[PDB]
Design a protein around this nucleic acid. Structure first.
Ligand code: NA
Ligand code: NA
Length: 327
DNA sequence: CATTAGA
DNA sequence: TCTAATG
């Protein structure tokens, strides 16, 4: 957590590189496992040698460990950090819609900057065109103070269209957080569950609501169960307009909400931890359900859930307010 | 890890 | 169809 820190950070750096700039999935994978196991090790790595005794700890990495050990740096590291191409990749990527493959392709074409991107919006797809267009706003945080004003409008039209809907704004937001990166709305309806053959319109109804009022401004992706978009709080009585925000609304079988909700609400550690417990408590948790464990090794059969409580009850735990779902 | 664009 | 990008 700190005694192995540099090694881990170097190593990760190392990894992320291969992965993006290069297409070295393996080396990349190689770095991460090492990064992983070195991270667990309970003592101070005093040399590649010692490190080397590890699993996944090859000669190539052990080598890198000495160089970092001996001199507070690493060339390859330094050389990469410098590399204008590589850098270019890492940057283009911040564009929403641009990922490794497109980064590399763009670079090769010579587009290495934000401006380059503009000059060639045509070589860009609708997702990326938007990612472009709100480059700033998308990197900006979301003040809870806004999360509250957004959430408020959202539940308002949800309810407006049909009183039967159930929306929940999951995430850290939900976990009390001072700010958030984007809003996650988990949606559900009774008239939609596990079997009941969809009702695409269920999703489409609301998206169209939000839009009709202007909360929705753009569509990154709209599928029959997951709409991915852009939204903005009405810019008041002037002088202050609102930054464009990333929103994600998703349909859910009324039969799977709470688990999903429970889940997406994290924290990643709270979940992991609760989940690990359900195992002892003879259970199985996962994004959509909770099944009872059968000694044969495994088992099935989705116990019924009506609230975040059921799932609690089931594993016989203390209901944890989302507030304290930190870990 | 599953859903969507796109070509 | 596959392949990429988000979460
Ligand atoms: Na080894
Ligand atoms: Na990106």
């Amino acid at each position: 957590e700190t005694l192995n820190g540099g090694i881990t950070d170097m190593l990760t750096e190392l990894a992320n590189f291969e992965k993006n700039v290069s297409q070295a999935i393996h080396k990349y994978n190689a770095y991460r496992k090492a990064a992983s196991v070195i991270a667990k090790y309970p003592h101070k790595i005093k040399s590649g040698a010692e490190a080397k005794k590890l699993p996944g700890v090859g000669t190539k990495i052990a080598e890198k460990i000495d160089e970092f050990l001996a001199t507070g740096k690493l060339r390859k590291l330094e050389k990469i950090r410098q590399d204008d191409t590589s850098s270019s990749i890492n940057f283009l990527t911040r564009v929403s819609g641009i990922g490794p493959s497109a980064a590399r392709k763009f670079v090769d074409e010579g587009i290495k900057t934000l401006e380059d991107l503009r000059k060639n919006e045509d070589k860009l797809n609708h997702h990326q065109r938007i990612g472009l267009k709100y480059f700033g706003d998308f990197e900006k945080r979301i003040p809870r103070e806004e999360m509250l004003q957004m959430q408020d409008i959202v539940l308002n039209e949800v309810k407006k269209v049909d009183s039967e809907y159930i929306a929940t704004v999951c995430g850290s937001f939900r976990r009390g957080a001072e700010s958030s990166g984007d809003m996650d709305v988990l949606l559900t309806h009774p008239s939609f569950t596990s079997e009941s053959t969809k009702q695409p319109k269920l999703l489409h109804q609301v998206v169209e609501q939000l839009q009709k009022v202007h909360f929705i401004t753009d569509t990154l992706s709209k599928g029959e169960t997951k709409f991915m978009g852009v939204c903005q709080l009405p810019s008041k009585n002037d002088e202050k307009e609102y930054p464009h925000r990333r929103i994600d609304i998703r349909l859910i079988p009324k039969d799977q909400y709470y688990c999903g909700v429970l889940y997406f609400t994290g924290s990643d550690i709270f979940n992991k931890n609760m989940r690990a417990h359900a195992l002892e408590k003879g259970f199985t948790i996962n994004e959509y359900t909770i099944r009872p464990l059968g000694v044969t090794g495994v088992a099935g059969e989705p116990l019924p859930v009506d609230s975040e409580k059921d799932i609690f009850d089931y594993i016989q735990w203390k209901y944890r307010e989302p507030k304290d779902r930190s870990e």
